[PDB]
């Protein structure tokens, strides 16, 4: 790998600089190099990995949605324009799939198997569900159902651990539940499960806020608002 | 080149799709492929080329400024942090220089020499001044003065043609004058020349607005406002 000659600490330092410069592709490459050093990631380092790839894939998903919509309209009274829209949508789609496969590969070799604490294991399993979810958004062929089930299975294992090992206000647990609820609504055609999950998560967090410091209260209530935003949109 | 097998029309079509998807690196690559087909560019195609590269280099310049500022602070009571900030600033700088060299290469081979109409020749010479200006922003060594003079010379030839062949409200002429005034203020250490140029350009355009249609009036007054914005900032 092209980061093989750079010190782990320097990769982390440069990932933080790339974040400040909004250079998320660089940030992701630096964090991939850091993961490939083979040592486990601290909490801050895990967040850097997630921020980098979420931003890279988020731009790819936004572009794919623009191009997919143009492609949809072209296939309605619409004039034939040739293969270009499909080709370019496919190009962006293949790039997106490549990023998802890269992230999933880092999780499989070997972040998840070395993650023993609940906070790291839940974090990585949530990421696995997220990146299979992004693959599912663009899937159409023989493995769409298997891709969806891979996302479900990762989210489910993360939920089981998070419920047993974390308080209901833990921001990792809240963000996992938020994303699993989105999976239910957007991927699994299960809006009732999505609503039930978001509501139960919100209510159980509400009841636990009294145990928190002012700073933790701020952290948890911010994610609760994201759950509330979805419930308002979905109900 | 990787676009050598794609039709010129398909490259143009995909450049427009990439713009809609805010995929400016792709847009630039498509427009580079279109230029390399060897045919002259229409007015719309010239604008696509400029939009693509302006957005790519604009992101690089913003990142370089962030990293340069961090580097400045590190060299003031500041703790020694190693070579990483300089290395990463250099990496972004080298990428930026590569983009500028790519654009300048397309202008030199062979867009400028085939551009005979004032509107195309002024457009390309303005681009030449712009991309030498971006090189000058990061230059420090033996050729900084020669880089600055290359920007000046391109802008000056574009100004001479634009003054002889275009009305003072022409949006190309206005945008050239805007950028040459920025060159004077930011690159050539000539704020009085920058102010004089912006003011004279604004006033000569004002006096010509009566000749324009409603749509052309809108086009010209928008760029005049950019000149006014700079004058307000600089005076
Ligand atoms: Ca080492
Ligand atoms: Ca028709
Ligand atoms: Ca052809
Ligand atoms: Ca100190
Ligand atoms: Mg290396
Ligand atoms: Mg119901
Ligand atoms: Mg090709
Ligand atoms: Mg004075």
Numbering used by the authors:
A (entry chain A), B (entry chain A): -4 to 71, 73 to 231
Quoted from the paper:
The 14-3-3σ protein, which has multiple interacting partners with specific peptidic motifs, was used as a case study. We have observed this phenomenon first-hand with human 14-3-3σ, a protein which has several hundred known interacting partners in the cell. Furthermore, different isoforms of the 14-3-3 protein are function-specific. For example, the 14-3-3σ isoform (but not other isoforms) specifically targets p53 and is associated with tumour suppression, making it invaluable to determine crystal structures of the target peptide with the correct isoform.
The methodology requires two main steps. The first step involves the growth of 14-3-3σ crystals in complex with a weakly binding c-Jun peptide (cJun-pS227) under the aforementioned ‘sigma’ conditions. Structure determination of this complex reveals electron density that is not observable for most of the c-Jun peptide, with only weak electron density appearing for its phosphorylated serine site. All models were determined to belong to the orthorhombic space group C2221 using Zanuda. The crystal lattice of the 14-3-3σ–cJun-pS227 structure shows that the amphipathic binding groove of the 14-3-3 protein is easily accessible for peptide exchange via solvent-filled channels. A peptide sample at a final concentration of 3 mM is a helpful starting point, as well as a final purified 14-3-3σ ΔC protein concentration of 12 mg ml−1. The condition most suitable for crystal growth was determined to be 28%(v/v) PEG 400, 5% glycerol, 0.2 M CaCl, 0.1 M HEPES pH 7.5, 2 mM β-mercaptoethanol and was used for reproduction of the crystals. Well diffracting and robust crystals grew in between one and two weeks to sizes of between 0.1 and 0.3 mm.
